[PDB]
Design a protein around this nucleic acid. Structure first.
Ligand SMILES: [Mg+2]
Ligand SMILES: [Mg+2]
Ligand SMILES: [Mg+2]
Ligand SMILES: [Mg+2]
Ligand SMILES: [Mg+2]
Ligand SMILES: [Mg+2]
Ligand SMILES: [Mg+2]
Ligand SMILES: [Mg+2]
Ligand SMILES: [Mg+2]
Ligand SMILES: [Mg+2]
Ligand SMILES: [Mg+2]
Ligand SMILES: [Mg+2]
Ligand SMILES: [Mg+2]
Ligand SMILES: [Mg+2]
Lengths: 258, 143, 164, 167
RNA sequence: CAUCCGGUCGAUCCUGCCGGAGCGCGACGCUCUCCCCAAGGACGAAGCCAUGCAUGCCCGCUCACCGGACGCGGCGGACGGCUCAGGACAACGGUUGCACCCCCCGCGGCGGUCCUAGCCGGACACCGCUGGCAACCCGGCGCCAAGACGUGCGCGCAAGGGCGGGCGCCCGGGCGAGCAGCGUGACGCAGCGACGGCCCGCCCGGGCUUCCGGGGCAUCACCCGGUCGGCGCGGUCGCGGCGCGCCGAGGGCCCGACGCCUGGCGGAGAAUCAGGGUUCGACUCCGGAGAGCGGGCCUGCGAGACGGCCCGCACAUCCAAGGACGGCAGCAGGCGCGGAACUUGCCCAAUGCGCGGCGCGCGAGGCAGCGACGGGGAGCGCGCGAGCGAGGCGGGCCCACAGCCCCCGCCGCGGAGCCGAGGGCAAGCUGGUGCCAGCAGCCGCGGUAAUUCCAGCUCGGCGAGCGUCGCGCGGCGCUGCUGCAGUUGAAACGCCCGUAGUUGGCCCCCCGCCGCCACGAGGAAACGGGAGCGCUCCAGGCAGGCCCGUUGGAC
RNA sequence: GAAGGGCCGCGAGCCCCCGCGCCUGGAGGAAGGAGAAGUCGUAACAAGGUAUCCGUAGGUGAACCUGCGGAUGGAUCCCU
């Protein structure tokens, strides 16, 4: 038993959906605690170095970040291991590039470019309502943020729109049958569909049945069902509309691209 | 039938095999432990010892010959064994009170051929292979 | 530990269970002379690859035709075999694979393709020429005798421009 | 040192488990406070640095506490005279040692100074006109450094009165 | 990727074993042209250790020398690295829970404090003067700083405690679940505040906990007595016989308790190969445990820590003999042991960690050296003359510096061994010796042709590798579930009753429950399988092309 | 608020006794195996010269002999 917390991370023990080469090295970056957890995040350096390719080493990324060249939800971050998560705003003014971090059908993080009109807010999932000091009602979300004095009409598992400049709630979408959702965990990450059924078991998990646009049906637990509007998405989504092709069609697409 | 065959009878079959697989001589010799404690080499490929007497052993009834062997004492056990140097005229290369390396015969621990009660072979003496000395590849002028 | 510990490795050939078998020795020597093979490890390699292909074909054939896995794997296997020239183009059924034989593998070697093109007098001459780097594939010099040529590169094999 | 790990016990079948590691600091214990009634001397309370930087205070000597009469909703700070009954053992009573559940006698002055003029339970009033009132301890000295409680009421009062009357 | 062969007889058929034939792991022995990848003191000594290195950084505090020193202060040193002694309802693997819990950094909030505030008080360190001692170590006096210590300006606020719901049950802050919060009567003034942080939530981590799995011996058959349960207090971050007092008597066992043994770390996995399985699992990832043996403790969010302190024991060192001092199962190196195992090298440039703004450090890690553990690719010729290797001398590319590969110029070292030739088992000619010397895994040869010994000729197998020894799988349907045998070869209890255990005829058209089949969710990779891609091929790797599914790494 | 002391708690080391496991000396006694071409007799294989064997009991230099009961793996598949 280790006598304290863990600070390192072996490369082979890192999450698969990070797509890290086996021979890159013994070690992988260890994300620091923040808005998102280890298994539902991706470090900034990976995006800035292994994807966009604006840097070729750790040091270059360190200089870029300490020179204030990236804003996360309107706030400059200088930590190369800062965790980036789902429905986050990634803006680089020096090149006028703005991206929203979402999931691809394969189950990995992707950068969807956005516009100026929709980059002043983000969507958050409310999963906990509790009373704080002095009995004051509170409310928490998936990105580690708390808001005091929420509307009584807002319940758990709902979705909340908040302005980036000011953490004030505008409108909220209820968790109900007939609402477009997006799956954010498990075997079905990145799929988009509409809720058709809700079944609860006393003392255990609650299972949600969803149907895709094409008629396919799939199941997942409520812990990773994210509402993204009322029958139509509230934000811009990837070019594909949450359709996972079968191995045959993916092979055809690969051969075509070959 | 003779063997139990019911759908809920795995325990009895396991116990039967557990008890009955001890009747094979090979399985006992391997998994019992007596041989390991009795084998002077303790499950090693070969051992190092000191020769103390050079002797000749007669062969069995249908053959007629005197085989050349030496008595050895193992460094790590202090017990006594008999090891036999096969190659022609190789006894003259072995001298009393000499360091030797002794290995086994083809069979694990049984006697081989017409040599009675001998289970070991000499392969190295004074750090030089006997097979190499016999072919004149090297010379033992250090001794 | 060192990163060199995670490097993989494997063997590529199999030895017969009964070595001293007269017909086998005769056939192996016959093939070695016909294709001018160096040692008997090449035949073992060919047998290994053939066994792999045959096992894949068997497993696929055990299943139903309309099995998604069967379709996927058979399509990939047939495409590979056709691209490599081992199997004739006009055959597109998994049954035909089990009839393949090592000689078909041998016929696609570089020595063979340059011999059937009249570019070399003999397999031995082909090997000697290949070693000296007088040959090229698609404008690139190849000096490996056992290099296997794909069908699309068959007409692209020629003499090295820079060779004397 | 003192520990409460279960590795040094026996199994449910009565077998010796065996030991596979040295002692750990998470599983430690400490010597009891043994809080004493006062009856260089004065109120003495110590402080203990517990896991996580948390602070725990154990009382070694004290003399006063807050007591409540629930039926009439009357509460004052009163001086504790002595311990008269304890279910665990009579040795604690002889030593006047304070623990949760001890039955004690408190001074009546803070209550009689305002009572004996309103209709209430007869028995508490009879106690009030005397020098002491029967009471109980509800806090945990040794963990919070205090000794509070409440005044006995009905069936429990009868139980303890019948217990201590013959003595 | 479903194989057999030789040996009991005067001959024959069987049972049955002995031996051969293959793969892998190590050691020994012979030999060795070129390139690529690559393990490496684990194997009843967790035995002993000279020598050098392995953890530092810096925002605050400069009347220091000419700001760099030094010191106070802060963060870190509880991660990483080594090994497998101990431990057999434990550890560990999968599956639950805390409505019995604690938690640094970081992210987001919140921020009201009972009764000199143009800025409070006193010290120590470094340093100066004077000194002790062999060394290690320190003493006394003296001016000075703080984001150090203490006090503390302020709208009431920490812990704990009493009271506050129903009338058979069910139909908001929140739950499956009377859980949270609040009011009110009394106690107590904890924390924050001389440049403003007490508190809350999330996150990583930890602690315990439900269910299932979790070595062998019956020449161990009965075992336990805080052992089993209840009441009460204490202690703990916290539940709990965790500890104490009192009460009662219980708990486990042939569905194998208890005891003993193990040359016993576990799993992901490895070897072998029709299918069913057998054996192993020191070592790459996860988890556990330890730092000579046995114990104890401070600091701190976090250690019962050992490159931290205290004691006993066993060892070891210096002494100007009064005293002082140590812990390589960290990297190199040495002794001992053994069948068995490498340089006392260079560097943070890459991957990461610590601190920190244009950087430092890191025996983690990388590079090189030895290296026939081992794996992959070429070659000692083709031809009647030309051509190309290795090798040397130079230039590039690469590299932290250098090699190496690769490319360009001038000269141009062409080298095969190890086993065997009666059968199994592919492969025969003279000369010696004479049951001697010797061969021979088994059958056997050798007492004058020795087809078997020792030599020459010739021949065969594999091949830069070949052979010998030990172990595991297979061979083996000779451990038999698939799938043996039991008249005579080895083997049916002398017979009956009988409990555990195992097995039990036929019948109901649909309801509930258990097994069963199928599908699905959820949960690490690496390995294995597998889609696509010409590292010149290959062992490999996840690349790569321009006019790329959003290029890809699907499952 | 130091040195120092008392009582309890954690608990090393030594002494005493008990038990368990693994090795090991020993006069003499007794078994087995191998080696050679030793001495005394012939028990078994043919009706092996008293048919062989099983159990039990006693006796004898040795193989073995005898008594009671049993089997044929016998030397008999066959007789009011
Ligand atoms: Mg005040
Ligand atoms: Mg202050
Ligand atoms: Mg062990
Ligand atoms: Mg580990
Ligand atoms: Mg430790
Ligand atoms: Mg320690
Ligand atoms: Mg050390
Ligand atoms: Mg350490
Ligand atoms: Mg048999
Ligand atoms: Mg018989
Ligand atoms: Mg029989
Ligand atoms: Mg006779
Ligand atoms: Mg007779
Ligand atoms: Mg007879």
């Amino acid at each position: 038993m280790a006598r304290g917390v863990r600070k390192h991370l072996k490369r082979l023990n890192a999450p698969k959906h990070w797509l890290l080469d086996k021979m890159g090295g013994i070690w992988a970056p260890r994300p620091t605690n923040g808005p998102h957890g280890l298994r539902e995040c991706i470090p900034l350096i990976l995006i800035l170095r292994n994807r966009l390719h604006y840097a070729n080493t750790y040091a270059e990324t360190s200089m870029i970040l300490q020179d204030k060249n990236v804003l996360i939800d309107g706030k400059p971050r200088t930590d190369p291991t800062f965790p980036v998560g789902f429905m986050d705003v990634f803006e680089i003014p020096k090149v006028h590039k703005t991206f929203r971090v979402l999931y691809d059908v394969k189950g990995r993080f992707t950068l969807v470019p956005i516009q100026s009109n929709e980059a002043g807010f983000k969507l958050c999932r409310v999963q906990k309502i509790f009373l704080g000091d002095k009995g004051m009602p509170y409310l928490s979300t998936h990105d580690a943020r708390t808001i005091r004095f929420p509307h009584p009409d807002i319940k758990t598992n709902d979705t909340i729109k908040i302005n980036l400049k000011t953490g004030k709630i505008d409108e909220w979408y209820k968790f109900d049958i007939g609402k477009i959702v997006m799956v954010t965990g498990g075997r079905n990450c990145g799929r988009i569909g509409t809720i058709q059924a809700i079944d609860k078991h006393m003392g255990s998990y609650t299972m949600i049945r969803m149907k895709d646009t094409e008629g396919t049906e799939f199941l997942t637990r409520l812990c990773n069902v994210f509402v993204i509007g009322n029958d139509s998405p509230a934000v811009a989504i990837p070019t594909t509309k949450g359709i996972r092709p079968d191995i045959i069609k993916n092979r055809e697409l690969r051969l075509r691209s070959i | 039938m003779s063997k139990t065959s019911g759908l809920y009878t795995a325990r009895k079959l396991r116990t039967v095999r557990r008890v009955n697989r001890w009747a094979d001589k090979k399985y006992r010799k391997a998994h019992l432990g007596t041989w390991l404690k009795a084998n002077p080499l303790e499950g090693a490929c070969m051992a190092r010892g000191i020769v103390t007497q050079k002797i000749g052993i007669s062969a069995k009834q249908p053959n007629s010959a005197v085989r050349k062997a030496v008595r050895v004492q193992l460094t790590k056990n202090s017990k006594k064994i008999t090891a036999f140097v096969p190659r022609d005229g190789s006894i003259t290369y072995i001298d009393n009170n000499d360091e030797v390396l002794v290995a086994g015969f083809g069979r694990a621990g049984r006697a081989v051929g017409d040599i009675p009660g001998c289970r070991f072979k000499v392969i190295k003496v004074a750090g030089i292979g006997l097979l190499a000395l016999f072919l004149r590849k090297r010379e033992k002028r250090a001794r | 530990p060192r990163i060199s510990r995670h490097r993989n490795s494997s063997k590529t050939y199999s030895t017969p269970k009964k070595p001293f078998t007269k017909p086998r020795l005769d056939a192996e020597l016959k093939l070695c002379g016909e294709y001018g093979l160096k040692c008997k490890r090449e035949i073992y390699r060919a047998r290994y690859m053939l066994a792999k292909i045959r096992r894949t074909a068997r497993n696929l054939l055990t299943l139903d035709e309309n099995d998604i896995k069967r379709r996927f794997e058979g399509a990939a296997l047939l495409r590979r075999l056709h691209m490599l020239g081992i199997l004739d183009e006009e055959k597109d059924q998994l049954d035909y694979v089990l009839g393949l034989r090592i000689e078909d593998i041998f016929k696609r070697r570089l020595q063979s393709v340059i011999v059937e093109s009249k570019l070399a007098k003999s397999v031995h001459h082909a090997r000697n020429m290949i070693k000296a780097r007088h040959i090229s594939v698609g404008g690139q010099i190849v000096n490996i005798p056992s290099y296997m040529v794909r069908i699309s590169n068959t007409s692209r094999v020629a003499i090295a421009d820079t060779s004397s | 040192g003192i520990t409460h790990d279960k590795m040094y016990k026996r199994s449910k079948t009565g077998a010796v488990q065996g030991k596979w590691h040295k002692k750990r600091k998470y599983n430690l214990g400490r010597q009891p406070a043994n809080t004493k009634l006062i009856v260089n001397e004065g109120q003495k309370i110590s402080t203990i640095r517990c896991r996580g930087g948390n602070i725990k205070r154990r009382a070694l000597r004290l003399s006063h506490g807050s007591f409540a009469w629930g039926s009439a909703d009357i509460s004052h700070k009163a001086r504790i005279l002595q311990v008269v009954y304890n279910s665990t053992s009579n040795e604690l009573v002889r030593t006047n040692t304070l623990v949760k559940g001890c039955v004690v006698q408190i001074d009546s002055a803070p209550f009689k100074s305002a009572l004996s003029n309103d209709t209430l339970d007869k028995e508490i009033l009879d106690q009030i006109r005397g020098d002491h009132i029967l009471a109980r301890i509800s806090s945990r000295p040794g963990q919070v450094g205090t000794a509070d409680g409440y005044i006995l009421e009905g069936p429990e009062l009868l139980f303890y009165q019948k217990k201590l009357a013959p003595k």
